[PDB]
Symmetry: C2
Subunit: 418 residues, 2 copies
Amino acid sequence: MTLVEKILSKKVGYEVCAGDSIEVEVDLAMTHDGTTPLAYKALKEMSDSVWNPDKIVVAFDHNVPPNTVKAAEMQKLALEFVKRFGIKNFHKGGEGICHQILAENYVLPNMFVAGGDSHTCTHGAFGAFATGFGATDMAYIYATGETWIKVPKTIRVDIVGKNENVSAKDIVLRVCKEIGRRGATYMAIEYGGEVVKNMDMDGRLTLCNMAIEMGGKTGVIEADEITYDYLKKERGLSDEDIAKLKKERITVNRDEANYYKEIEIDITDMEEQVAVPHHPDNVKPISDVEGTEINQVFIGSCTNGRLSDLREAAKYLKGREVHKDVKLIVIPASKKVFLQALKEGIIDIFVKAGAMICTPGCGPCLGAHQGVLAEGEICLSTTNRNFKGRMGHINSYIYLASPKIAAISAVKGYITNK
Amino acid sequence: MTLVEKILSKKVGYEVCAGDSIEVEVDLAMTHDGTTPLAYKALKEMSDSVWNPDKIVVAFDHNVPPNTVKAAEMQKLALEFVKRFGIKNFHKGGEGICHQILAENYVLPNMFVAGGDSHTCTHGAFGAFATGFGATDMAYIYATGETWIKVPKTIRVDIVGKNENVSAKDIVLRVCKEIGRRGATYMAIEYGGEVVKNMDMDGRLTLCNMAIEMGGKTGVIEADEITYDYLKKERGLSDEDIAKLKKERITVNRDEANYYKEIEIDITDMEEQVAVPHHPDNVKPISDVEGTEINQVFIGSCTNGRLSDLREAAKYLKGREVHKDVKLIVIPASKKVFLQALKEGIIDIFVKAGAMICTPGCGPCLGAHQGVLAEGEICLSTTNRNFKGRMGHINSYIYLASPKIAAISAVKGYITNK
């Protein structure tokens, strides 16, 4: 029995196998400024109320503040969803990215998280089963708190070795390379090993987030002490709640689980990994892409927008200034990350370096305004998507790398390690 | 002899008066990301060189970060202009508003300041003749360093009395009524009196900024010791350099200057001012619009985006949170202003209250794709424009007020004063 089978079995109250179709109760339902309207429209035709407003989260992160009339009409319509259904857990523009809000305030281990977003798989780092759903599907979830899901197969990814010169994004890019953009199709990506157990919670959320970029239905990491300490830090979880959570802790024994595929990654010495346009799996080491001049550098997104991502980037921008031909865009993942990075003096480092700061949202990682590339512009982003013409013009280029590389490259003006 | 007549005469070398068409050598030329590519493309048809790169200033502020592909293409074209002609006085995105930057490190008294912006008249607070030109005229000036204008008539505006509950925005809004939105066309505005004399440069910048809103060709304020003190705090200093500017100081004597018309504004027992849709020449006192539901509040344009404006707004926003049904947007006018407000903890108060901090520029303005309004949505702004469908939908509404009132109304969710 794999981890996803373990979680789902405890969820329904009986042993379940991969391939089965079971009814699962939803512990956490969420839509954002882009997926709320359609979900709301469908909900009007179906129900006059929701099943539990305390388990429903709504956040504005895609178009904040409204950059178009249409986006303004979207949030306007989403505002009525909060009103007409009495949604207490509503996060306005500036609160931050939806998944970051869910992580630092809501998601508990062994939960079944249902989200109106493709990258809902991010919250599998808590030891929960989190997948994305369509707007019509989320409507029924809002009205009943239930949904049907097929227990997916599991790809075991063992990350062993030790390398302090690389970050979690460098590792997850390495995993994307060996597996591919279609390698984990219809399958949950169960991370584990020496590195994963010693990896911080900010890093675990990075690995589970890019699960969709490998075709993965979701990503999941076993609940740990780091998971519990994170729950102690970001939220006021009492010791009675940690202990209550530890008795329900789910672990996986040896050979008690049969995986579809079991890949293993040695992290040493593996220099910093960089994804090459126009696909997330096109990952090359730093030496193979050295000297590549860039026009724009973005540091934010759900993948690397947390406090630790800004802190690392701030220590390389602490001395110098952003290159003349390079524009730096910094966007904290949430309102909490923004505040904490203010008092820490992290923001001061950025602004002095000439970095452009935007309100906590999904930045220009999508469509999206707030940082559009022109024809020919190269952007070294820290997000999780390299699709051709995603950050603007169809003939623009996007590179993916850690906040460390992004910070250093912004100074030098070219992709570098020194 | 009016102030404008004295400024233009010294600049040209001989005595001129209103009605005379003269050729003036330009001391300072500036275009932003929205007008630089327009002026460059126009320059590529007639000339093949700029007259003086040192006298040319380029600053990105309107669309920072790039909101559309066309906007990104424009900024790329503007980079060509700077790279080609070696414009050392170039400011990237995040540096701040074009007029604010120009006031922080360029505009000297007695100058002739030409700008590719309808609010270049702001720099008349330094005692310099400053007007706005189109893309065509900006190319002409870029090539020859000279332009052809007609010496305007002067509507003298004496502001006397005392009031410590209103602001410079409240004052300049009072001026726009007695005069009108078209009661100063083809004419220059000359502010004087005990109030203007006691104003800091933050107040004088506001008065000269709203000159075009009255149809005025420009708004100019006589330079004094307060003007020189600002040039010490900002662009470095020297008591010998200030003395070198006082030797060229231009003063105006009463009755020795014949104006087209003279107006005097009472301020002692005046209420605070809020302009109603859809024109800047429509303010009823705060008691006449108190209770008006607002859906969005913007604080921080060229009119009211400086340090004093932020600290005043943070004062009423201190400890409180922004009302639920209204989204607050705060944008510092400059990079320098941003930094000194960060070290003062002013930004923290904004973020704690739930404001949406954006890159130091001007948005939403003319639909700059920043904080776009939807249909039936009302915004209270500290900007200078009030026209129908300015911030988005044609059926949207805009109200103009001071940062003080803007902050308070953001707290209570409606236009108020308490």
